[PDB]
């Protein structure tokens with residue numbers, strides 16, 4: 001599938017990708033922070 | 049990319065019946081061998097299965113049951129199971145039989161306070177309130193001088209209104225030191241006032257000030273709302289006998305004085321009964337009779353036993369659970385007369401008795417395993433078998449009591465779990481009630 005789409009797009013569909021050109025920028029430090037819900041949230045979530 | 053978690057609030061303390069979660073009966077009314085934290089005692093658990101229906105029926109008053117059986121058999125564990133089985137909303141009132149000896153009020157009356165506390169009531173109260181920033185405040189004077197009105201202008205995010213109010217409310221606003229620019233709340237049914245602070249609009253007017261500031265109230269200046277209030281008959285009885293509602297000097301000063309208990313008279317309870325029946329008739333109220341649990345019943349005085357003859361024959365009184373662990377003792381207050389469980393025959397004829405009985409070695413092992421995993425500790429099988437033997441030699445209470453001490457030794461010498469050698473060490477540091485009673489009998493010349 002992929003190769004067909006690539007060849008169809010190539011004559012009209014420029015790309016860059018940040019890491020080729022934004023060489024002077026810092027990379028995004030990306031955090032996922034898990035949180036624990038409260039007593040009031042437990043009561044309602046359970047009732048649902 | 050990076051992942052993080054936070055939670056540091058210390059979890060709830062473990063205690064002597066925190067493993068019990070309910071009776072663990074099946075739908076047919078029979079008892080499962082092990083469920084919801086209980087094991088064994090099938091006839092007594094089946095009997096408690098009848099009593100949780102007797103409570104939820106709402107039909108009855110003054111029915112009473114006695115849990116009886118040797119120390120360490122699980123009487124109060126069952127009564128605590130029933131308190132789980134009824135759920136939170138039915139009032140369950142725990143009491144010990146030595147609490148009747150107050151220094152403020154007669155024993156005969158302390159019982160009545162507890163009975164009236166075990167009947168709950170649920171009320172759909174409607175409150176009407178005014179709230180806003182006070183933009184204007186003006187009294188209107190009249191002749192024999194008097195105050196006829198106060199005029200108050202209030203402001204909220206919706207707009208403004210202006211109200212004419214009784215001098216009682218002006219007296220209250222003065223007392224609360226209210227001024228223009230303050231945000232206030234008034235409930236018109238009670239006549240009560242609360243100051244919240246100055247409106248946020250003014251919060252930058254000074255470099256240095258003592259006040260807290262609040263955002264402008266949302267919604268209409270005047271509104272009425274329903275609050276579902278849970279209460280007991282006792283709470284109505286007492287709040288009328290030494291009042292603190294309203295806003296007069298007398299009630300306001302009665303909030304400062306030392307709160308002595310008092311013998312509420314039969315005329316007040318009579319008038320409160322009529323009021324709550326009229327709240328039920330209007331469909332404003334629902335009644336929820338609950339349970340009174342009187343542990344260690346064997347040491348009420350004979351004056352108190354002879355009062356329960358009358359209180360259990362009331363058409364109002366809630367369902368009562370007594371508990372006792374005594375043989376043919378002398379009845380307190382009589383000095384001469386002995387009877388089963390320490391209770392007079394005349395009262396013992398007005399109760400149904402539930403027999404509770406000693407555990408087998410297999411049951412003790414099972415309870416110890418349940419309890420160890422409740423206290424959060426890991427135990428090896430040969431250790432647990434050793435504790436089982438200690439149980440048969442002593443008492444299951446002592447056998448359970450060694451668990452946490454053993455776990456401390458285990459972590460001190462770097463083991464994750466109780467090994468047999470830990471239990472075998474702890475058993476020699478702490479004596480039990482029989483082994484200590486031996487050494488103290490041998491050396492009886494010296495104590």
Ligand SMILES: Nc1ncnc2c1ncn2[C@@H]1O[C@H](COP(=O)(O)OP(=O)(O)O)[C@@H](O)[C@H]1O
Pocket residue numbers: 064065068085086087088089118119120121122123124125126373415445
């Ligand atoms: N059947 C049972 N299942 C589980 N735990 C039990 C059982 N019976 C008693 N226990 C527990 O054993 C201990 C002794 O029971 P308890 O209710 O204190 O006995 P008592 O009848 O002397 O008041 C308590 O920790 C209690 O929770």
